[PDB]
Design a binder for this molecule. Structure first.
Ligand code: NMN
Ligand code: 1X7
Ligand code: NA
Ligand code: NA
Length: 322
């Protein structure tokens, strides 16, 4: 009648199971290419649950079992941003974008390649990892102080609990509610006699600011990550490389990015994705254009208000394109 696992055996097995389950979840949710059928995942997940039940000391805050929600907070602690979450200067016309390029070429003294990305219209987030483990999730707030929504973000399945390497990094991006989920949610709320959300951004914000993680877990949220606060522990020397590296270590990144060699190529990208906007399952409010080379970003630096190496081209509001 003796239990099969010792504490040390249970500890090692739990570690193995967590690594495997984190991999499978990444494949299933982020790659959208699961290597195993659901029954395989479910089987290993149950084994972990049973270990954690028998040995509660082995439960880690980042374990796959901590994803499902249930915890309820009394309030959100403030979440300072030691490195500010800056906002970009905006452009609205072809003139604004070509003028930006002219200013960049003036400062650098040669043509400059640009990493072009979609500007995801959701809730800006910062994800802190310590030795490869998710330890803090925060909203942007005013860019200097946000809200600690760590537990809520654990329920968002695209957020990795562990990275492929044990690095410490502060990763920034957006969390959003897909358009199809938003419309469904609003109908559910209508039927419940609840106030509807004005748009998917408010719906994502409402969801991430719920104190009851069980409620948050029921909502459909996703993420795209595109930068870090400090590239010190990263190998990347360009923004395009940085996106590849973030994807490699386990973050969901947006696949529509393109490296452009001239501002004329940047313009074509802007035109391309204005047309593609309606076909995407997530909202965008424009296009972000960044000098690709980190060396050149460093040279350009920031003004008091924003980077001198990037601009956001703003499309008309989503509401103006039905
Ligand atoms: N096939 C897989 O690798 C895989 C990974 C994660 C979740 N799932 C499925 O998603 C559902 C929920 O699982 P989780 O709450 O652990 O994310 C279950 O039906 C599970 O089978 C499947
Ligand atoms: N891909 C990007 O750079 C990007 C996407 N979506 C956003 N809301 C933002 C905001 C800043 Br600041 S950058 C950025
Ligand atoms: Na969810
Ligand atoms: Na369209």
């Amino acid at each position: 009648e003796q239990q099969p696992l010792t504490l040390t055996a249970a500890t090692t097995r739990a570690q193995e199971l967590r690594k495997q389950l984190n991999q499978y979840s990444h494949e299933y949710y982020v790659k959208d290419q699961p290597s195993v059928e659901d029954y395989v995942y479910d089987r290993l997940y149950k084994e972990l649950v049973d270990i954690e039940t028998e040995f509660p000391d082995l439960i880690t805050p980042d374990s796959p079992t901590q994803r499902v929600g249930g915890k309820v907070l009394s309030g959100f602690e403030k979440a300072p941003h030691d490195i500010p979450m800056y906002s970009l200067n905006d452009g609205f016309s072809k003139e604004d974008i070509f003028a930006f390029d002219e200013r960049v070429r003036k400062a650098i003294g040669k043509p400059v390649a640009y990493c072009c990305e979609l500007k995801i219209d959701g809730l800006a987030i910062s994800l802190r990892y310590e030795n490869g483990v998710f330890v803090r999730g925060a909203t942007r707030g005013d860019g200097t102080v946000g809200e600690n929504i760590t537990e809520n973000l654990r329920t968002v399945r695209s957020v990795p609990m562990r990275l492929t390497e044990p690095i410490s990094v502060e990763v920034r991006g957006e969390c959003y509610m897909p358009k199809q989920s938003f419309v469904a949610l609003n109908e559910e709320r209508e039927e419940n006699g609840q106030d509807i959300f004005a748009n998917p951004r408010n719906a994502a914000a409402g969801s991430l600011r719920q104190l009851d993680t069980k409620i948050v877990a029921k909502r459909n949220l996703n993420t795209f990550l595109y930068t870090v606060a400090d590239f010190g522990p990263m190998k990347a020397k360009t923004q395009f490389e940085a996106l590849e590296e973030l994807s490699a270590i386990g973050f969901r990144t947006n696949p529509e990015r393109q490296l452009c060699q001239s501002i004329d190529e940047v313009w074509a990208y802007i035109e391309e994705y204005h047309e593609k906007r309606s076909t995407l399952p997530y909202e965008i409010d424009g296009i972000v254009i960044k000098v690709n080379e980190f060396a050149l970003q460093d040279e350009l630096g920031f003004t008091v208000k924003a980077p001198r190496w990037a601009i956001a081209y703003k499309f008309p509001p989503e509401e103006a394109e039905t």
